[PDB]
Write a protein that binds this ligand. Sequence first.
Ligand SMILES: O=S1(=O)CC[C@@H](C2CC2)c2ccc(F)cc21
Ligand SMILES: O=S1(=O)CC[C@@H](C2CC2)c2ccc(F)cc21
Ligand SMILES: N[C@@H](CCC(=O)O)C(=O)O
Ligand SMILES: N[C@@H](CCC(=O)O)C(=O)O
Ligand SMILES: C[As](C)(=O)[O-]
Ligand SMILES: C[As](C)(=O)[O-]
Ligand SMILES: [Cl-]
Ligand SMILES: [Cl-]
Ligand SMILES: [Cl-]
Ligand SMILES: [Cl-]
Ligand SMILES: [Cl-]
Ligand SMILES: [Cl-]
Ligand SMILES: [Zn+2]
Ligand SMILES: [Zn+2]
Ligand SMILES: [Zn+2]
Ligand SMILES: [Zn+2]
Lengths: 263, 263
Amino acid sequence: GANKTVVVTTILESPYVMMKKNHEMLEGNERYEGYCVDLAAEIAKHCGFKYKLTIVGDGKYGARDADTKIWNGMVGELVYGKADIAIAPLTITYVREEVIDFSKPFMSLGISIMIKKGTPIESAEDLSKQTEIAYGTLDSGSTKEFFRRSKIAVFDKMWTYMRSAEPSVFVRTTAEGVARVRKSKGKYAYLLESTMNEYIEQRKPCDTMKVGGNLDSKGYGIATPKGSSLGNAVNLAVLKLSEQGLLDKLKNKWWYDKGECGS
Amino acid sequence: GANKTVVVTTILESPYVMMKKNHEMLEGNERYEGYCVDLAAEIAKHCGFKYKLTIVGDGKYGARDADTKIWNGMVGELVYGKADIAIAPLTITYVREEVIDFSKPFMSLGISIMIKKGTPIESAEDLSKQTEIAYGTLDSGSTKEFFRRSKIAVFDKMWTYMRSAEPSVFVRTTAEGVARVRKSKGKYAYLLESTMNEYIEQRKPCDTMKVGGNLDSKGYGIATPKGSSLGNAVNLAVLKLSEQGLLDKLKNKWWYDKGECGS
Ligand SMILES: O=S1(=O)CC[C@@H](C2CC2)c2ccc(F)cc21
Ligand SMILES: O=S1(=O)CC[C@@H](C2CC2)c2ccc(F)cc21
Ligand SMILES: N[C@@H](CCC(=O)O)C(=O)O
Ligand SMILES: N[C@@H](CCC(=O)O)C(=O)O
Ligand SMILES: C[As](C)(=O)[O-]
Ligand SMILES: C[As](C)(=O)[O-]
Ligand SMILES: [Cl-]
Ligand SMILES: [Cl-]
Ligand SMILES: [Cl-]
Ligand SMILES: [Cl-]
Ligand SMILES: [Cl-]
Ligand SMILES: [Cl-]
Ligand SMILES: [Zn+2]
Ligand SMILES: [Zn+2]
Ligand SMILES: [Zn+2]
Ligand SMILES: [Zn+2]
């Protein structure tokens, strides 16, 4: 039928989607800024659709409850028909690809370690061989699932510790994990995706750093419900933006051009 | 109908697919070794098919002739029904994704610079600002197309030089490009994918090196003809192998465990 405004689900996560300063009482898409706001504008332009940005109701990325089998987060909004597309730092995973469609990745990342500067930790192995420094992940995302599912000795040892550690080492938002690192005097390290780690490393007060290599290698993709008519065009649009260098320009724009910790 | 042996097209490119020493007179898949041989075995196992490895007849990756509009290389073998699947260092690109299907990537790479050690070159900008040192690409692949299509000032300048340079700066195989670097006393630099660059850097006589950052960011994917019944299962299999850490183990096995230039 007639063209319809596409409902985009996304998540308030810096620097992907942020409320512009003093824009809370304004309307529509102009309230928001960030890498994924710019990406949504390009994808929509290349695919020829109008869209409305909406923030996922429960503030989550997406996981399947083991008991009820219900999907939450942005994945759930696609699965249950609340949104037409997710344009967000949403990680491509096997269990998600079974229930939604992902474009080719628009950004690469891996799980990484954030420390407060000076923390005597250089690797995941270092974390796993000690107990003075606590460590955790975002509480309902692909990083937590990576540790839950891993059969690699070091990551299995870390999961065995994290899943029963008290108080909980898991946090509700990236901002909570960063704040916990910054206030714990070196006694908390946060396991998060390298993209968010490297963004925070360039933000005042410049007191965190990414240490060691990444624990895995994957990417974010644009997600659509299974069988959506948008998937084919969205996928090609990502590849076009990649080959044009636009994705590189946007990463520099939101990570490093605006860095607050020097050159 | 009944299960049929899947015809795999691939390419003789180290360390992805190599003839085992003294295996030329043997038969079937056991003749070959490499990263993509190991990957094919896993993909076939996870998808439940038997397969036959075949080397692409024309030795090419795949490009579309501007005059005849015919696809060559492994892409052509899929397009024209000569093979059922390509398991190879085949780069995900927009023009290929229009005519074949790609899985999610199984390996990341970017275009990079190979120099003979000691060459006074650190970047693509350095190459573009001088003429003493020639530079080129593989003659019928995604790297050449990257330069042909780029609107970025430095890469446009490099393309303007490469496309009319005489003798040709393009080579027929990666091995030819490496040999040209090694014998040109520093007066030829080779533009190739970072994966092949970093492999050769660890091979005797240990006289080349990768310099500068990568020029772009992309990946290899497993390719199937449009609408093939294999695509969905192959795509999930790649993600499963990724999440299990198998792709990481295979990269280490074929790049660094067997490195000949020290630790
Ligand atoms: O779509 S993926 O998650 C498939 C797995 C890995 C591949 C195995 C190296 C990967 C890497 C970069 C990226 F940007 C996305 C992805
Ligand atoms: O499937 S891709 O070619 C889509 C573009 C880039 C994305 C833009 C960063 C990418 C990166 C790693 C990889 F392994 C594959 C690909
Ligand atoms: N990008 C992740 C969320 C962040 C994390 O888990 O580290 C996801 O899609 O679940
Ligand atoms: N992987 C490339 C070939 C090598 C290159 O062009 O550098 C392709 O699929 O065309
Ligand atoms: C339920 As708990 C181990 O995250 O506090
Ligand atoms: C046709 As030519 C410029 O590669 O020798
Ligand atoms: Cl808009
Ligand atoms: Cl997941
Ligand atoms: Cl912009
Ligand atoms: Cl076999
Ligand atoms: Cl191409
Ligand atoms: Cl093995
Ligand atoms: Zn365990
Ligand atoms: Zn760093
Ligand atoms: Zn030009
Ligand atoms: Zn290097």
